[PDB]
Amino acid sequence: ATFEIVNRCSYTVWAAASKGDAALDAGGRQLNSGESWTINVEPGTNGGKIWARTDCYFDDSGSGICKTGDCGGLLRCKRFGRPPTTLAEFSLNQYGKDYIDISNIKGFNVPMNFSPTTRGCRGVRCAADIVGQCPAKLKAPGGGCNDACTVFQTSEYCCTTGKCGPTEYSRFFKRLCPDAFSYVLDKPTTVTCPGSSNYRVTFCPT
């Protein structure tokens, strides 16, 4: 499948693409305002994620640091990124279907639209001002709005027993972005698309 990743933000972001134990395509790249990056993702890929990173510094060897979404100090991510990170999530070619979603389970840094560029399903978006409205205890100094699991490390926020309910904090994310996951056992906002669809991820869509 092909993904086109577009930065519509007025600031630079460093895009990242990983399946947790490996890069997808090159794994990461700088995107100035308006730039597009096209990647290829192997059919059958289960548990892929795309995210933006903010305020990065890299040397010539591709080693450095980002304020949100850092993946072990690398430009080309092999692993998932440090919260807070708005996440585009996908599993492809699973018994003839693709499954996509946006998640706030690991917090929010940048607004996002995740849409098919082929026919047969709809897209999803979280584009509200979550950082501006973020509750004081969840604000990250580096930028962004952390989830409650990352901050407080309780069984209820992290859903460690497989039983948990919504919380004051999960309800904040859900109020601003109904079409994204707000906690592990949220009613699913997953979209089912035809197998082998192609997609576009747009940062700062509005």
Curated annotation (Swiss-Prot):
Keyword set includes Signal: yes
Keywords: Cytoplasmic vesicle, Disulfide bond, Signal, Taste-modifying protein
Record GO cellular component, one term: cytoplasmic vesicle
Subcellular location: Cytoplasmic vesicle
Pfam families the UniProt entry points to: Thaumatin
InterPro entries assigned to the protein according to its UniProt record, in alphabetical order: Osmotin/thaumatin-like_sf, Thaumatin, Thaumatin_CS
Disulfide bonds: 9-204, 56-66, 71-77, 121-193, 126-177, 134-145, 149-158, 159-164
Domain of life: Eukaryota
PANTHER family: OS03G0233200 PROTEIN (PTHR31048)
Family that this chain belongs to: Belongs to the thaumatin family.
Function: Taste-modifying protein; intensely sweet-tasting. It is 100000 times sweeter than sucrose on a molar basis.
Protein name: Thaumatin I
Taxonomic source organism: Thaumatococcus daniellii (Katemfe)
Biological classification of the source: Eukaryota, Viridiplantae, Streptophyta, Embryophyta, Tracheophyta
